[PDB]
A paper describes a structure:
Type IB topoisomerases (Topo IB) are found in all eukaryotes (where they are referred to as TOP1), in several archaeal phyla, several bacterial genera and several groups of viruses. TOP1, also known as swivelase or untwisting enzyme, can relax both positive and negative supercoils by nicking DNA, enabling the rotation of the broken DNA strand around the complementary intact strand of the DNA duplex and catalyzing the closing of the nick. In particular, one topoisomerase from the hyperthermophilic archaeon Caldiarchaeum subterraneum (CsTOP1) was found to be highly similar to human TOP1 (34% sequence identity, 53% similarity) and to display similar activity, while being extremely stable. Here, we solved the structure of thermostable archaeal Caldiarchaeum subterraneum CsTOP1 in an apo-form.
We solved the crystal structure of both selenomethionine-labelled (SeMet) CsTOP1 and native CsTOP1 at 2.0 and 2.20 Å, respectively. In both cases, the asymmetric unit of the crystal contained two TOP1 molecules. In the asymmetric unit, each TOP1 molecule folds similarly, and there is no significant difference between SeMet CsTOP1 and native CsTOP1. In its apo-form, CsTOP1 folds as a compact protein, comprised of the CAP region (1–207), the CAT region (208–412), the linker (413–469), and the C-terminal region (469–524). The electron density of the C-terminal extremity of CsTOP1 (525–539) is not visible in these crystal structures, suggesting that this region, which is poorly conserved in other archaea, is flexible. The enzyme displays an open conformation resulting from one substantial rotation between the capping (CAP) and the catalytic (CAT) modules. In the apo-form structure, the TOP1 CAP domain does not block access of the DNA molecule to the DNA interacting region. The Lip2 loop segment moves towards this region and partially covers it. More precisely, the side chain of glutamate Glu278 (Lip2) forms hydrogen bonds with the Nε atom of His410 and the hydroxyl group of Tyr477. Therefore, while the DNA cavity is not blocked by the presence of the CAP domain in the CsTOP1 open-conformation, the Lip2 loop interaction with the catalytic tetrad may hinder the entry of the DNA molecule, and its displacement seems necessary for DNA binding.
Residue numbers in the entry:
A (entry chain B): 4 to 104, 109 to 524
B (entry chain A): 3 to 523
The structure:
Amino acid sequence: WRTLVHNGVALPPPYQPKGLSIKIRGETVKLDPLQEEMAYAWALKKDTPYVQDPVFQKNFLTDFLKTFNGRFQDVTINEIDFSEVYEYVERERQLKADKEYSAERKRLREELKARYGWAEMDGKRFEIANWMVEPPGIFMGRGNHPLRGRWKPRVYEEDITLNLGEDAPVPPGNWGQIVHDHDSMWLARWDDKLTGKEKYVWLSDTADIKQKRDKSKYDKAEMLENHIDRVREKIFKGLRSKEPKMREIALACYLIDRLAMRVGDEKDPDEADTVGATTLRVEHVKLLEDRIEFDFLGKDSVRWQKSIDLRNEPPEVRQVFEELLEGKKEGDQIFQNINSRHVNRFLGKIVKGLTAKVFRTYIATKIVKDFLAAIPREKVTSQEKFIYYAKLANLKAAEALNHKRAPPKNWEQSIQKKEERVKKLMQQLREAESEKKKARIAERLEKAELNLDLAVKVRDYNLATSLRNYIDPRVYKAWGRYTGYEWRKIYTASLLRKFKWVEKASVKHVLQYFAEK
Amino acid sequence: KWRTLVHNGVALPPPYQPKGLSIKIRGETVKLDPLQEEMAYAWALKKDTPYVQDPVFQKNFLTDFLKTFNGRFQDVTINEIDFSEVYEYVERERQLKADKEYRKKISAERKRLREELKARYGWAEMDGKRFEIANWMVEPPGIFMGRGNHPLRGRWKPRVYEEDITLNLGEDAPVPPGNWGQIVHDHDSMWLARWDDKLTGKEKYVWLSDTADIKQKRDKSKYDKAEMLENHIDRVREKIFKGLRSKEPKMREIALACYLIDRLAMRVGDEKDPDEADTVGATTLRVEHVKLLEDRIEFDFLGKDSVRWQKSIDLRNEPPEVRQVFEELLEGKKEGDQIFQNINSRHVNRFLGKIVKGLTAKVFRTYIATKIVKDFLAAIPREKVTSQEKFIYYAKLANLKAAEALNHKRAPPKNWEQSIQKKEERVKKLMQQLREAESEKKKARIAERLEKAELNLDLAVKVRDYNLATSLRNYIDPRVYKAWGRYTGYEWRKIYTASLLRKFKWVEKASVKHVLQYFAE
Ligand SMILES: [Cl-]
Ligand SMILES: [Cl-]
Ligand SMILES: [Cl-]
Ligand SMILES: [Cl-]
Ligand SMILES: [Cl-]
Ligand SMILES: [Cl-]
Ligand SMILES: [Cl-]
Ligand SMILES: [Cl-]
Ligand SMILES: [Cl-]
Ligand SMILES: [Cl-]
Ligand SMILES: [Cl-]
Ligand SMILES: [Cl-]
């Protein structure tokens, strides 16, 4: 770049003390501001599973107990009474759900965005992706990070170096450095004060930000594995709720869990014609004694059918379906009060960051993992067999996520052509005694035989949708490492660029699952 | 975009020469066709290695081997096969090699043909400039192996042919002789040739020597060989002892130099690189540097800047051939005489490579230094790694242990004594600035810098006599430090300068499971 101007980064607001106390072994202790700021972060997690994790507890106390001037060094979490801090949190939670409004925050939120959210690079205006420096808080990763529960210390202007053009105005701030690095694209830089990792501020719509955001989705899905039981319990509790809006939302979430059905309002053309909760009409659903049948004919003339065996489903499932169908005509929409905002608000209250898209990524990724884990390594005899199994796993995820498609236009004859190719190769090598020739015919035979079986199996399904969007590429990198074969050949050049981040990423989480025996 | 690109393609392996050998399966003599014999002979070449005792290696090998007998024997297990006839041919041919190869029958002529093939295939022209091609030989087929735990170990690597190979050439470059599978003109690609590995499915590329692709591949290869040595160090040591008992005195001297690699991590001594040229090495030892006592041997080397290096080996549990060869080399020499007069890296690496293909003095000392670092970090409780700066501190103390092990001893820095006092004052001041600290922001900013000052002071004292950079750049597998970062959660990239992060760029993609499993034990 030639010139680059921006207003730096927005630092978090200081913590506001509330005069709260805790009890340690019966002794009331008045919290200092930093003590209270940490006790408050812990309290905000009071209803999460993390505060029951002994590694999480020990890491938190490592930073917490250091603030007590030498006292309480051998205290454990069970000997601290946080109830005063919990009560403040619950009170603020109730107050936040009661102030239906003082909407002058939009002027203040918009004022920050206009001030810090835009950089001007070589005369052009560009949005900044991450201009807010996050406030201090408790560190968390995907579930097994060794530093989980440790405090992330507050970052100040002096820790931050800004990248600016030489003729740009130095924005207000006690910055630690202003560098004129025409070579590098980043806007601001600083070291994370817990992990030692370098933190960068990038323009929106850049390679670094999209790779980060792409990987973050699959990371949330991996984390979901730790919480899926609780999610399912809260979906069913929602179905039993007294509030009809809650029952309807919970039922849409039940359909995500059970059928991997999308919400129905996403506009992306890859899935816009597939079934979704909001496009279900009364005529698409039949409630029977032992099952619920779904039968949906889409715009593309694709008929999608699945059923749910009610034998071992909770009774509240049929109860809410009956409630929503009651009194409606066959052409009426079933889910008339649903959209992605309501669904993701419900899910997000169970697991922060959880959305329907993350949920379906977890589903598709688990299906692929479980399919491949069931294959004895001795059956994976070649690169072609490796690809074949990878694709059958992709197909299982496609059918699970309802990525049904109209058959390829000339599928009928192309199968005979693959059947012809198999036939012709079949005895082409039967009349060739040279083993160098009888070997390079054997190789294309199995490639053709596997490619034929695959071509029959994939006719009605678009595998690309889940391969591009819902299957964690770490599963296929791990499958490559587990078996020895070339997993990059599962992907187009385009998807290899999209998943460039997988090259550096650990696959221990998946590979340990394959290697269990 | 290159504009023109000219080369002669790649050199294909020589065809296998059948020998008319047979094996026995369940007592039935079976005559081997060419491919079966080729595979049986490869297996026989490993008859005295651990690999042929590994059930995974066996199953993989039998998967491809039994496939050659298309109807019969599809049920056979490895113990039902009698390879003794192939074993005998191998032993006969290797005993035959115990007479003359480094003579003129296989010296000048072997040399001449080697240079002839290099002149034919080793050079490309790109945009009118001539460049050496790094890997113009297609490797012959054989039994696949990785670093020790590869899932395809024991599988056959099938022969590659001209018809399998794509060449990348300018549109109007001459088409080199050969039945190439395809000629492309891809101005966006720097590779010269490409084919699929017929076992692993990985795409194989031919590159110019001056590429990142080759530099990175050669850098990682050294550390991979050192990782693989971990499984074989006992056998290597026994073959060193065996060399010490050889009847040829030149092999005995070479063996003793290799023994000093193993026991003291002592370099050969002939490498010109200034990083190590002033440290002790086998070829730099003189009679007065070595005291042979009754149950131990003491080394006392006085080098540049009056730096004295001293280490000793306890001999009482050592095999007597160690003392034997030392006495042999010391006898008839007086003060000032060089002990190892027929030693260089070529002879040493020839000897080591006969034990393990690709093994060299540098690979051996990389294994030593890497194990030292791994063992040091593995013994550290996670509770002690309390911060990024503590993490870096322990990493450097491990680095120092490898420096001491590999004899990278140096004279203390010019102003060390005063550069130690100055840090003692800066910590003294830093503590008083933190007692009078006020705001939380201030109490933490000084705490940050104080902890850094105290650790750096203790480091500065401990590293006075050793150059840590040599082993960090050359002998410590960076996967150890990446794994240390993953085990603890801290940023391992700060262990490295920008230069070393470039050299070790390959570690970003590399698995560290082999080391991390050891830390997580
Ligand atoms: Cl932001
Ligand atoms: Cl975590
Ligand atoms: Cl979690
Ligand atoms: Cl600040
Ligand atoms: Cl949707
Ligand atoms: Cl809700
Ligand atoms: Cl890989
Ligand atoms: Cl090769
Ligand atoms: Cl291996
Ligand atoms: Cl040397
Ligand atoms: Cl690797
Ligand atoms: Cl791995």
